[PDB]
Amino acid sequence: KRMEDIGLEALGMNDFKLAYISDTYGSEIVYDRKFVRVANCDIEVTGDKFPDPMKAEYEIDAITHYDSI
Amino acid sequence: MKEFYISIETVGNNIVERYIDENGKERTREVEYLPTMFRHCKEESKYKDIYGKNCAPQKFPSMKDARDWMKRMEDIGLEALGMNDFKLAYISDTYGSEIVYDRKFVRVANCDIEVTGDKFPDPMKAEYEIDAITHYDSIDDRFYVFDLLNSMYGSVSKWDAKLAAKLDCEGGDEVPQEILDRVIYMPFDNERDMLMEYINLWEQKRPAIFTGWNIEGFAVPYIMNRVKMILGERSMKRFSPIGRVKSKLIQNMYGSKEIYSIDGVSILDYLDLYKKFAFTNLPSFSLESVAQHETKKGKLPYDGPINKLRETNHQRYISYNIIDVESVQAIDKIRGFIDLVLSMSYYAKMPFSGVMSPIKTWDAIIFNSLKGEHKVIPQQGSHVKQSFPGAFVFEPKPIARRYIMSFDLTSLYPSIIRQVNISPETIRGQFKVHPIHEYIAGTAPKPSDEYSCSPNGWMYDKHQEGIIPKEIAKVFFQRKDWKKKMFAEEMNAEAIKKIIMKGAGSCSTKPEVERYVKFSDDFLNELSNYTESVLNSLIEECEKAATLANTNQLNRKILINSLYGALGNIHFRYYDLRNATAITIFGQVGIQWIARKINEYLNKVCGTNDEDFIAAGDTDSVYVCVDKVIEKVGLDRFKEQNDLVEFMNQFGKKKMEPMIDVAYRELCDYMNNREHLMHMDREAISCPPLGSKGVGGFWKAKKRYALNVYDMEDKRFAEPHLKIMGMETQQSSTPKAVQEALEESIRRILQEGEESVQEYYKNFEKEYRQLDYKVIAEVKTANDIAKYDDKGWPGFKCPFHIRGVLTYRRAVSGLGVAPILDGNKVMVLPLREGNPFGDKCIAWPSGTELPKEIRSDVLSWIDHSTLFQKSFVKPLAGMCESAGMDYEEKASLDFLFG
């Protein structure tokens, strides 16, 4: 905000998340999908009439959370 | 002299202000401000807000500290008091008292740029080469014209001022020598050199205002874009003192305007400085048209397309720019806008650029007024938009109305707010509502006898004057005072020039010239005791005083007129739905109430009952037929138009005040309002010419009519000037020749009578075919050249014009002519069935005649009958139908029936 009040380019990455990953690892990163926890979920509500996703008016009955690890 | 600012901006926690010193020199300073917010305090304090609740000041070390404090305190659910935008606050504290300014020291630049390219140069793409810049400056009163000798399109020669002075007969550009004398020309071989020199010139004399025609259209948006694309983004930022320049697109409107906001220079587009403060509706707002309408100067006719004018006659091009820039300055001298932007900015104690938006202006004025009285303004509460009722337009029964008396009340909304005290802190409560019909005729019981109100069903105190009422009263009083000072100077100058014509020979001496005040007889004699040169000098001083007084008067007019456009806005901090509807529907009630009262009075005076005389009014105006009264009087008493207008005006005086005064007075007490303010004056009248069977004045629909105006606002006319509005005479769809023909037909309908319309019809039909086809061609804009059509052929529903556009485009495949560019002067001509093109209409840009291969084909296949039917027959027929007049002979036997 200081340098954007005198109009000087603020060079350098401005998304700290990207910067953190680069400095934390640097070298090419070797991974393993086996140890990452993906979740597959589908639900079916007890709805006589199909409701809105954010307007909830019918009771949830389906529990599903498949895991990878 | 006293200090005055010219541009105030914010950088970090500092305020950068450019100010003129005591010696007339410009300097820049940076001040670390100390904002003073206000917050509710339980204990007694002197800073009582408008509501009455006590308030105490909190000062901060940094602006950002107050910025954080606002949100930090708001998130707990309490209301902050004071300003949120500290520029107005800084200006208010720095100057406080009235600000004295001399327009001379404020450098008002001016610039118009001409670029040449194959297609229309796109301000945003910025592909072409800027080859004429022509910067203007006020302090140096010199036109710095930059010329690009060598260009990618073509390398031209130099420019001769002497030749430019010479007339076209000799071969010159007939440019006034005075402009040529004040032109500092410089040429450049390449582009970077010229653009860097323009940067340097903009750096040496940083203007305070940067006007010019369409500056925020093809000038700033291009100059900035080009330097960014050819000299890099860093050098482009040299255009501002703060070094901060920004661009925001406005796709909200169809036009993609990449408007810029150079900080330090107040970019004020003269086009939008004119459409707002002129109140004059020219058919087109291009520079040449408006210059001709205002300055009366006529542009020199030119040859060929504009993009080629550089290579054919470059000596014509540069002079074409030198006159183009100065046309704006001449329009300025005639209208004096830059002496109004400055005046309003300094009277409102705000930055220049804020003059455009009325909410900022009114916010600034309201803050300063309460500040001195030790008060603190609320904070802008968030609301949502509503479509509250619009203007109530009366019912037009499109029958000929003979003569009518058109009158409306002056300054509706300020008067309403003055008389109902509609203010955020004067709202008491809601009283039980009744249908609008109930109050509109008084059938409903009296709303109350305690507080004033509106048809909105609310309550408003009488013994407590609001903020808006007091402030509108202050502006009204200032307007009246400044107008009176202007007329005082007027009679002063008149007496001075009469003394001059009497003669005055003496020594030379200028005494103390008191301004804006009429001179005494002794002072007049003393001034007569000087030379003629001193008399002319005092006349010039009086002219300067008159300019200042006129600027103040028009400033007040502009302020008051743009008030209701703020209190009805959700971002004006004093916004309420209840108030924004109360003003509107009280206006509605007022207009319908006076409608009912005038109907009653006319019925009583004429004896008959259930007669409607008001026609086609708006929420301001009523146009009474006032015909039957003259019939009762007897038209045989009159022998000339002027006598009829005299009885007209005398009856208007006898009718308006004694009737409408009481017809608003009973409404006032009925509404228990503060004071009666609404008054009306006979703005215009339309007498049909005496002894002729012309209908006088008719209507077609809502807000469409014709009026044989004879006396507009006490300004008598020797000959009448018809007041058209809405019909095809103004829209660009009808060709100019047909527009003039339609106006002539309208005058003949209103003034002469039946036979004249038909004989003019026959004459126009006679001369319609023989004339040139361009002046009857319906020239329109090509918008969607490819959206509708599938492949050349008009695939989906095709607009009348697009079908002709594609017809001509497919007709000239390989003919060696430039195809249509969108927005060109493409004229649509319907063609007789069976034309070799393969359609019903053809549209090509104007100026390119039909090739001999197809010229005879189109001439033999032309269908003037259809063209004539839609261009003149239809418009005239509808007007004649709404005028009770048959524009074609009907071949009746009524001559033989008796």
PDB file of N, CA and C in Angstrom, chain B residues 19-78:
ATOM      1  N   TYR B  19      -0.709  24.485  -4.079  1.00  0.00           N
ATOM      2  CA  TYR B  19      -1.301  25.750  -3.677  1.00  0.00           C
ATOM      3  C   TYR B  19      -0.529  26.904  -4.289  1.00  0.00           C
ATOM      4  N   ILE B  20      -1.219  28.024  -4.463  1.00  0.00           N
ATOM      5  CA  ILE B  20      -0.633  29.234  -5.026  1.00  0.00           C
ATOM      6  C   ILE B  20      -0.216  30.148  -3.884  1.00  0.00           C
ATOM      7  N   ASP B  21       1.013  30.650  -3.946  1.00  0.00           N
ATOM      8  CA  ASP B  21       1.584  31.416  -2.846  1.00  0.00           C
ATOM      9  C   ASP B  21       1.046  32.845  -2.862  1.00  0.00           C
ATOM     10  N   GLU B  22       1.650  33.707  -2.046  1.00  0.00           N
ATOM     11  CA  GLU B  22       1.234  35.099  -1.961  1.00  0.00           C
ATOM     12  C   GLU B  22       1.766  35.944  -3.109  1.00  0.00           C
ATOM     13  N   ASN B  23       2.725  35.427  -3.873  1.00  0.00           N
ATOM     14  CA  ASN B  23       3.280  36.127  -5.020  1.00  0.00           C
ATOM     15  C   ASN B  23       2.756  35.585  -6.343  1.00  0.00           C
ATOM     16  N   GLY B  24       1.729  34.743  -6.308  1.00  0.00           N
ATOM     17  CA  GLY B  24       1.204  34.149  -7.524  1.00  0.00           C
ATOM     18  C   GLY B  24       2.062  33.043  -8.098  1.00  0.00           C
ATOM     19  N   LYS B  25       2.720  32.268  -7.243  1.00  0.00           N
ATOM     20  CA  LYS B  25       3.553  31.155  -7.666  1.00  0.00           C
ATOM     21  C   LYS B  25       2.985  29.859  -7.105  1.00  0.00           C
ATOM     22  N   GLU B  26       3.136  28.786  -7.870  1.00  0.00           N
ATOM     23  CA  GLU B  26       2.568  27.489  -7.534  1.00  0.00           C
ATOM     24  C   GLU B  26       3.609  26.632  -6.827  1.00  0.00           C
ATOM     25  N   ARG B  27       3.201  25.976  -5.741  1.00  0.00           N
ATOM     26  CA  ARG B  27       4.089  25.112  -4.979  1.00  0.00           C
ATOM     27  C   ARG B  27       3.318  23.891  -4.501  1.00  0.00           C
ATOM     28  N   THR B  28       4.064  22.877  -4.076  1.00  0.00           N
ATOM     29  CA  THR B  28       3.507  21.627  -3.583  1.00  0.00           C
ATOM     30  C   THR B  28       3.950  21.413  -2.145  1.00  0.00           C
ATOM     31  N   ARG B  29       3.033  20.944  -1.302  1.00  0.00           N
ATOM     32  CA  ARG B  29       3.381  20.633   0.076  1.00  0.00           C
ATOM     33  C   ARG B  29       2.716  19.331   0.491  1.00  0.00           C
ATOM     34  N   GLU B  30       3.299  18.689   1.499  1.00  0.00           N
ATOM     35  CA  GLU B  30       2.791  17.439   2.048  1.00  0.00           C
ATOM     36  C   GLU B  30       2.585  17.622   3.542  1.00  0.00           C
ATOM     37  N   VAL B  31       1.373  17.343   4.011  1.00  0.00           N
ATOM     38  CA  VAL B  31       0.989  17.566   5.399  1.00  0.00           C
ATOM     39  C   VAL B  31       0.508  16.251   5.990  1.00  0.00           C
ATOM     40  N   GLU B  32       1.047  15.888   7.149  1.00  0.00           N
ATOM     41  CA  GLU B  32       0.578  14.707   7.869  1.00  0.00           C
ATOM     42  C   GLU B  32      -0.643  15.117   8.678  1.00  0.00           C
ATOM     43  N   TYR B  33      -1.820  14.729   8.205  1.00  0.00           N
ATOM     44  CA  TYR B  33      -3.067  15.206   8.780  1.00  0.00           C
ATOM     45  C   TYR B  33      -3.388  14.482  10.087  1.00  0.00           C
ATOM     46  N   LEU B  34      -4.280  15.091  10.866  1.00  0.00           N
ATOM     47  CA  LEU B  34      -4.738  14.549  12.145  1.00  0.00           C
ATOM     48  C   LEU B  34      -6.260  14.525  12.142  1.00  0.00           C
ATOM     49  N   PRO B  35      -6.866  13.445  11.657  1.00  0.00           N
ATOM     50  CA  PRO B  35      -8.329  13.401  11.560  1.00  0.00           C
ATOM     51  C   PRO B  35      -8.985  13.462  12.929  1.00  0.00           C
ATOM     52  N   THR B  36     -10.184  14.035  12.962  1.00  0.00           N
ATOM     53  CA  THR B  36     -10.927  14.260  14.200  1.00  0.00           C
ATOM     54  C   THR B  36     -12.306  13.623  14.061  1.00  0.00           C
ATOM     55  N   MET B  37     -12.407  12.342  14.400  1.00  0.00           N
ATOM     56  CA  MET B  37     -13.701  11.691  14.313  1.00  0.00           C
ATOM     57  C   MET B  37     -14.547  12.053  15.528  1.00  0.00           C
ATOM     58  N   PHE B  38     -15.818  11.675  15.483  1.00  0.00           N
ATOM     59  CA  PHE B  38     -16.744  11.983  16.560  1.00  0.00           C
ATOM     60  C   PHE B  38     -17.552  10.746  16.913  1.00  0.00           C
ATOM     61  N   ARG B  39     -17.682  10.483  18.213  1.00  0.00           N
ATOM     62  CA  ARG B  39     -18.350   9.283  18.693  1.00  0.00           C
ATOM     63  C   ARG B  39     -19.259   9.640  19.859  1.00  0.00           C
ATOM     64  N   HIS B  40     -20.332   8.868  20.013  1.00  0.00           N
ATOM     65  CA  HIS B  40     -21.323   9.153  21.041  1.00  0.00           C
ATOM     66  C   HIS B  40     -20.692   9.147  22.428  1.00  0.00           C
ATOM     67  N   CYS B  41     -21.081  10.122  23.245  1.00  0.00           N
ATOM     68  CA  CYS B  41     -20.639  10.217  24.627  1.00  0.00           C
ATOM     69  C   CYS B  41     -21.851  10.385  25.529  1.00  0.00           C
ATOM     70  N   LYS B  42     -21.851   9.665  26.652  1.00  0.00           N
ATOM     71  CA  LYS B  42     -22.995   9.717  27.557  1.00  0.00           C
ATOM     72  C   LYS B  42     -23.062  11.049  28.295  1.00  0.00           C
ATOM     73  N   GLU B  43     -21.912  11.597  28.676  1.00  0.00           N
ATOM     74  CA  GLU B  43     -21.886  12.862  29.391  1.00  0.00           C
ATOM     75  C   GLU B  43     -22.209  14.019  28.451  1.00  0.00           C
ATOM     76  N   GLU B  44     -22.529  15.166  29.046  1.00  0.00           N
ATOM     77  CA  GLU B  44     -22.889  16.340  28.264  1.00  0.00           C
ATOM     78  C   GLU B  44     -21.677  16.872  27.512  1.00  0.00           C
ATOM     79  N   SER B  45     -21.883  17.236  26.247  1.00  0.00           N
ATOM     80  CA  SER B  45     -20.819  17.772  25.412  1.00  0.00           C
ATOM     81  C   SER B  45     -21.388  18.850  24.500  1.00  0.00           C
ATOM     82  N   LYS B  46     -20.496  19.719  24.020  1.00  0.00           N
ATOM     83  CA  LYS B  46     -20.925  20.815  23.158  1.00  0.00           C
ATOM     84  C   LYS B  46     -21.267  20.331  21.755  1.00  0.00           C
ATOM     85  N   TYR B  47     -20.679  19.218  21.318  1.00  0.00           N
ATOM     86  CA  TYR B  47     -20.855  18.731  19.951  1.00  0.00           C
ATOM     87  C   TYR B  47     -22.122  17.888  19.883  1.00  0.00           C
ATOM     88  N   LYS B  48     -23.259  18.574  19.816  1.00  0.00           N
ATOM     89  CA  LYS B  48     -24.549  17.913  19.683  1.00  0.00           C
ATOM     90  C   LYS B  48     -24.873  17.730  18.209  1.00  0.00           C
ATOM     91  N   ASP B  49     -25.147  16.491  17.813  1.00  0.00           N
ATOM     92  CA  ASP B  49     -25.393  16.180  16.412  1.00  0.00           C
ATOM     93  C   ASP B  49     -26.786  16.664  16.012  1.00  0.00           C
ATOM     94  N   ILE B  50     -27.179  16.380  14.769  1.00  0.00           N
ATOM     95  CA  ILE B  50     -28.457  16.864  14.254  1.00  0.00           C
ATOM     96  C   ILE B  50     -29.617  16.270  15.042  1.00  0.00           C
ATOM     97  N   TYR B  51     -29.531  14.981  15.377  1.00  0.00           N
ATOM     98  CA  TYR B  51     -30.590  14.354  16.158  1.00  0.00           C
ATOM     99  C   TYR B  51     -30.725  15.009  17.525  1.00  0.00           C
ATOM    100  N   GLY B  52     -29.601  15.306  18.169  1.00  0.00           N
ATOM    101  CA  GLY B  52     -29.614  15.885  19.497  1.00  0.00           C
ATOM    102  C   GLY B  52     -28.743  15.112  20.463  1.00  0.00           C
ATOM    103  N   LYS B  53     -28.398  13.884  20.089  1.00  0.00           N
ATOM    104  CA  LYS B  53     -27.557  13.050  20.933  1.00  0.00           C
ATOM    105  C   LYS B  53     -26.165  13.652  21.063  1.00  0.00           C
ATOM    106  N   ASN B  54     -25.621  13.594  22.274  1.00  0.00           N
ATOM    107  CA  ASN B  54     -24.315  14.169  22.544  1.00  0.00           C
ATOM    108  C   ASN B  54     -23.220  13.376  21.839  1.00  0.00           C
ATOM    109  N   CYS B  55     -22.103  14.053  21.582  1.00  0.00           N
ATOM    110  CA  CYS B  55     -21.001  13.447  20.855  1.00  0.00           C
ATOM    111  C   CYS B  55     -19.702  14.114  21.280  1.00  0.00           C
ATOM    112  N   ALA B  56     -18.619  13.344  21.244  1.00  0.00           N
ATOM    113  CA  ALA B  56     -17.315  13.787  21.698  1.00  0.00           C
ATOM    114  C   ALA B  56     -16.260  13.467  20.651  1.00  0.00           C
ATOM    115  N   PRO B  57     -15.218  14.294  20.556  1.00  0.00           N
ATOM    116  CA  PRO B  57     -14.208  14.109  19.511  1.00  0.00           C
ATOM    117  C   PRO B  57     -13.078  13.181  19.921  1.00  0.00           C
ATOM    118  N   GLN B  58     -12.660  12.357  18.967  1.00  0.00           N
ATOM    119  CA  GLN B  58     -11.505  11.484  19.109  1.00  0.00           C
ATOM    120  C   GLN B  58     -10.522  11.824  18.000  1.00  0.00           C
ATOM    121  N   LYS B  59      -9.313  12.215  18.381  1.00  0.00           N
ATOM    122  CA  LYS B  59      -8.274  12.569  17.429  1.00  0.00           C
ATOM    123  C   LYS B  59      -7.279  11.425  17.296  1.00  0.00           C
ATOM    124  N   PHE B  60      -6.676  11.320  16.119  1.00  0.00           N
ATOM    125  CA  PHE B  60      -5.802  10.207  15.796  1.00  0.00           C
ATOM    126  C   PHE B  60      -4.459  10.725  15.312  1.00  0.00           C
ATOM    127  N   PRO B  61      -3.399   9.943  15.476  1.00  0.00           N
ATOM    128  CA  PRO B  61      -2.083  10.391  15.007  1.00  0.00           C
ATOM    129  C   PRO B  61      -1.908  10.217  13.506  1.00  0.00           C
ATOM    130  N   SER B  62      -2.588   9.232  12.924  1.00  0.00           N
ATOM    131  CA  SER B  62      -2.443   8.923  11.511  1.00  0.00           C
ATOM    132  C   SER B  62      -3.807   8.704  10.877  1.00  0.00           C
ATOM    133  N   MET B  63      -3.888   8.993   9.576  1.00  0.00           N
ATOM    134  CA  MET B  63      -5.131   8.782   8.842  1.00  0.00           C
ATOM    135  C   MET B  63      -5.514   7.309   8.819  1.00  0.00           C
ATOM    136  N   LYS B  64      -4.538   6.429   8.591  1.00  0.00           N
ATOM    137  CA  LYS B  64      -4.827   5.000   8.584  1.00  0.00           C
ATOM    138  C   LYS B  64      -5.341   4.531   9.935  1.00  0.00           C
ATOM    139  N   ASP B  65      -4.926   5.191  11.020  1.00  0.00           N
ATOM    140  CA  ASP B  65      -5.449   4.834  12.333  1.00  0.00           C
ATOM    141  C   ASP B  65      -6.949   5.083  12.407  1.00  0.00           C
ATOM    142  N   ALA B  66      -7.404   6.239  11.925  1.00  0.00           N
ATOM    143  CA  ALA B  66      -8.838   6.497  11.875  1.00  0.00           C
ATOM    144  C   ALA B  66      -9.530   5.546  10.909  1.00  0.00           C
ATOM    145  N   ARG B  67      -8.862   5.210   9.803  1.00  0.00           N
ATOM    146  CA  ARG B  67      -9.435   4.269   8.847  1.00  0.00           C
ATOM    147  C   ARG B  67      -9.714   2.924   9.504  1.00  0.00           C
ATOM    148  N   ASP B  68      -8.757   2.420  10.284  1.00  0.00           N
ATOM    149  CA  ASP B  68      -8.972   1.180  11.021  1.00  0.00           C
ATOM    150  C   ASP B  68     -10.020   1.362  12.110  1.00  0.00           C
ATOM    151  N   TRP B  69     -10.032   2.533  12.749  1.00  0.00           N
ATOM    152  CA  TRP B  69     -10.960   2.782  13.845  1.00  0.00           C
ATOM    153  C   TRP B  69     -12.402   2.726  13.374  1.00  0.00           C
ATOM    154  N   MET B  70     -12.679   3.244  12.176  1.00  0.00           N
ATOM    155  CA  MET B  70     -14.050   3.214  11.674  1.00  0.00           C
ATOM    156  C   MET B  70     -14.593   1.791  11.639  1.00  0.00           C
ATOM    157  N   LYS B  71     -13.866   0.873  10.999  1.00  0.00           N
ATOM    158  CA  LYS B  71     -14.356  -0.498  10.891  1.00  0.00           C
ATOM    159  C   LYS B  71     -14.327  -1.206  12.239  1.00  0.00           C
ATOM    160  N   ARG B  72     -13.291  -0.952  13.047  1.00  0.00           N
ATOM    161  CA  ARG B  72     -13.200  -1.599  14.350  1.00  0.00           C
ATOM    162  C   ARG B  72     -14.380  -1.222  15.233  1.00  0.00           C
ATOM    163  N   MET B  73     -14.770   0.050  15.218  1.00  0.00           N
ATOM    164  CA  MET B  73     -15.892   0.488  16.032  1.00  0.00           C
ATOM    165  C   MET B  73     -17.212   0.062  15.405  1.00  0.00           C
ATOM    166  N   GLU B  74     -17.303   0.056  14.073  1.00  0.00           N
ATOM    167  CA  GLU B  74     -18.548  -0.333  13.422  1.00  0.00           C
ATOM    168  C   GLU B  74     -18.885  -1.794  13.683  1.00  0.00           C
ATOM    169  N   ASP B  75     -17.877  -2.673  13.691  1.00  0.00           N
ATOM    170  CA  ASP B  75     -18.181  -4.095  13.812  1.00  0.00           C
ATOM    171  C   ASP B  75     -18.863  -4.450  15.129  1.00  0.00           C
ATOM    172  N   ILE B  76     -18.819  -3.573  16.138  1.00  0.00           N
ATOM    173  CA  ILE B  76     -19.570  -3.811  17.366  1.00  0.00           C
ATOM    174  C   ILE B  76     -21.002  -3.308  17.269  1.00  0.00           C
ATOM    175  N   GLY B  77     -21.354  -2.610  16.194  1.00  0.00           N
ATOM    176  CA  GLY B  77     -22.729  -2.194  15.986  1.00  0.00           C
ATOM    177  C   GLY B  77     -23.084  -0.820  16.513  1.00  0.00           C
ATOM    178  N   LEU B  78     -22.199   0.158  16.343  1.00  0.00           N
ATOM    179  CA  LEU B  78     -22.473   1.534  16.729  1.00  0.00           C
ATOM    180  C   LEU B  78     -22.158   2.460  15.562  1.00  0.00           C
TER     181      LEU B  78
END
